[PDB]
């Protein structure tokens, strides 16, 4: 598993990847069947294609880290930021990710909802 150093490194890549809206980028930071879970009780997005596809669904954007990475030993890590995009809307989010023996991503956790909109 990739250390606390090397975790926060690569969320901290990810957060790029996805600011930069580097679709076939950020797939190959997720393993081949990673796991990705919803805020919404929706059922998960499993596997490179389907996570593919919902990225490319999804992305007008800004993302960035509005603190450190919180990186642990054990392959995990979790961050918050910041989604930045008519009017000028923010949402907070923080996202939990366990890496595999690879440094791919094996599974993600989100977490916001409407409470962390603001449409201002």
Do not use: C
Not at 59 to 74: E, Q
């Amino acid at each position: 598993l990739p250390t606390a150093q090397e975790v926060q490194g690569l969320m901290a890549r990810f957060i790029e990847l996805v600011d930069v809206g580097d679709i076939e980028a950020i797939v190959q930071m997720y393993a081949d069947d990673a796991t990705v879970e919803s805020p919404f009780g929706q059922p998960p997005i499993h596997g490179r294609e389907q996570i593919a596809a919902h990225y490319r669904q999804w992305l007008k954007f800004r993302v960035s880290l509005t603190g450190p990475v919180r990186a642990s030993h054990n392959g995990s890590g979790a961050m918050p930021l910041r989604k930045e995009w008519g009017q000028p809307s923010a949402l907070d989010v923080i996202l939990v990710m366990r890496f595999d023996e690879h440094g791919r991503i094996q599974t993600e956790q989100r977490y916001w909802s409407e409470v962390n909109l603001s449409v201002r």
